[PDB]
Symmetry: C5
């Protein structure tokens, strides 16, 4: 039923509307969120040399694939709110504060008009299109670019990240370009800071393209 589906959304989102979206998505014991992160390359927009040196600015279009469990967005799918999945705006719920650290701008831009899909068991899946602008090295007909992602404020004991389907590389399921990928690897690291306290989880991708 269509009414129940909307009443169900209002039901789940009501917590977030009354207490806000800030803070880890647990009402009971505060646990650890495990984010599944995937990066699917679509195309290169431009590679522009910085000055007359061997660095350059690479602008890419990609799809950022995110998944996590939100304890607050749970229901039992039995009459009449008997659905396995529901569509929700990412601006109406908690979302990981995942940033592109080495962004040449403030951050990557994600299309937040892109809806997320919430399952009965609380598993959120959010797959926004994305624009990424980073500093590359352009030397000997090769453009090598790094991409660095992680939660800004949450440590490993609060937000953790692992590669989707444990593939430590740029995914090519959405690839639509003609460029030759010379190199494609990634890495999960736990990094400590002179500014802060604990370890933080960062996914570091390395991409190299034939120029």
């Amino acid at each position: 039923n269509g009414l129940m589906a909307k009443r169900l959304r209002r039901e789940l989102l009501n917590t977030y509307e009354q207490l806000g979206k800030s803070g880890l998505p647990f009402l009971d014991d505060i646990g650890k969120v495990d984010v599944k992160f995937g990066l699917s390359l679509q195309l290169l927009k431009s590679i522009e040399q910085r000055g007359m040196g061997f660095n350059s600015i690479g602008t890419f279009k990609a799809i950022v694939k995110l998944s996590w469990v939100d304890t607050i967005l749970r229901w039992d799918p039995e009459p009449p709110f008997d659905f396995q999945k529901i569509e929700i705006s990412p601006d109406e719920i908690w979302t990981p504060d995942i940033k592109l650290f080495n962004s040449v701008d403030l951050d990557m831009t994600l299309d937040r008009t892109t809806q997320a899909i919430v399952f009965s068991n609380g598993t959120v899946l959010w797959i926004p299109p994305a624009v990424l602008k980073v500093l590359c090295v352009s030397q000997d007909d090769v453009d090598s670019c790094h991409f660095q992602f992680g939660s800004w404020v949450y440590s490993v004991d609060e937000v953790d990240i692992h590669f989707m389907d444990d593939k430590a590389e740029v995914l090519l399921d959405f690839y639509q370009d003609s460029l030759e990928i010379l190199e494609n690897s990634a890495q999960r690291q736990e990094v400590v800071y002179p500014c802060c306290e604990s370890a933080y989880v960062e996914m570091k991708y390395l991409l190299a393209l034939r120029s």
Copy 2:
């Protein structure tokens, strides 16, 4: 009478103000939304070579024509609400999440200040101007460009798309440029992905222009 027109709109939008705009537009049994889609080209803004390769970024001006039925927005066209149609802002109703997938930016931009028209039988007509920026091949005095459109999170079970007026082509009813058109064809496909389960309707246009 202008009061009744406004009262009508308010009473129709009551449901959306209470339950939100997310989710398929049905209150009773949840069906399948069928969107009629039309791409009307107006003009080329620019075509810029990417680096010194054979690809380029094409930036276009177009009119995107969309129609579908919204069961929630139905009335009895008899006094004092004898109106055939009513004008609505698309930010007050559900709209299909149709994106330009091969967008070199986050997505195409639609002018969402453009008003939609809704008839008494729940048929919605929305015709927003649009800006489209896609990757083209520029070779042999011809520029070939592709436009890929589809609902982002909805499968063919939920949102289906068909060419408006069975015309599988870029429409030229708003054409205002001086460029020579060499190829113009489109295709409705059903696509599966490794991220997802079911089939997704994508509309793929091919446009080639004399450089």
Copy 3:
């Protein structure tokens, strides 16, 4: 008295706050809106060749002058509401949905922080600065540009447009540039479309400039 003037505005705008700003500005019998339209050129920002052909993109600074009657905004100018006119934001009332159809971008941009003035008889005068970007033909040291304006959704029986002061030309009352104007003509047309039924009013300007 300043309070009363503020309270008048509140009483006038109460209808729009409660009923919405969509729909023609009549609360009794629904009539036709007659819009007076004036385009006053201020200056040329740039004219840039598109590729290596005869076409170019011209970006203009202008003042768009608009006047219409809003029945909802009328009042009897007797104490304590003895004001001949009042200033209001155009985001708080109905405004005609007039677009620059042949814009190379989504549309022209009007400055909507610019206040409108409303007279006690309901006449609205709104004169927002505007940026317009169109395709031009640059050939033989002459740049020829067109501007095409119209209500997007309302036909001639709903929203009519006429040149302000019956001057079928780009107005030069705000002109402050050094360019030599070589041609300056305009025409009001009633245009029929494929997608739609009735006739739509379009104001079409031709402006030629010494390159």
Copy 4:
């Protein structure tokens, strides 16, 4: 006391929250606002030739200094509200609709996150940073640029403007550039328009720089 300072602000702003920010800032008899206006040049971002002619677009960074009396924002500075001044957001109060008339863009951009200061007598001081883009004449190694400011809708009987400290010149208290200034002049004018009936006050600046 910190608490009382916030209560006072809430109490002062209550009038604008109920009645709105539109309209001259008087609750008793409507008088004349006399805006004190200063333009303080910081630096030149760029001067770029338009086409191959003698005009160019000058983009400047400046501080716009504004001051006026808002009789609605007055209080008596004795306990528990014994403050000589209070900080307020300019988007919470009436501000003069002062535009850069000869902007090449829609208008100058003022930074409206910048707080204003109100003294207990109702005098408002607001000093936002600003970006200004205008037509210049670039000839004989001199760049001559004009700046024209005024209230868009209010005549001299409603909003007057005078040079801050009666300095008819671009002010150099914030000047941080290395450019040679060759002429720095200004004039306050009462201008009569055809669209309108009374006189409007315009501040006109001439600034010439060594190219």
Copy 5:
């Protein structure tokens, strides 16, 4: 407990919600806010010569680190509010109006989507990424740039600023560029203004890079 954390946030923010974010963060006796400021360079986006002179515009990506005590955001960390710290959006609490004075645009842009952390003793820590655009001198293969920061409206008796960790220099804990740093120093100044009354705290950084 997760719910208890959200309720704590709602309790802390109620003051700001009922009373507003404007004004120094004290509910009792108004005192001085002492801000710790750190500037961490990440990379150079670009440096573009202005005209054909010895100046240029440098565009930098950095991390701005701010810390200060907000007396309003204090709680006793005993059950059931036994949390040492909580994340809060910076648009929900007072933040110092610290500006990049010598910005070539309106201001530096800070990523305000970035959450701040508040500890139970009222200490706020906020570390937004930032883009900074300033005037530089490009001479003898050296690009020398200045950065000037301070509170816009608050004097030394209201908002003070000191170098975070007493490091009077640009910090390199986030530095991801390949550029050679020639000069790196900074200085806390107390500056009296002619437009105004008291003394203002400004942080002035000097950075020279190899071209």
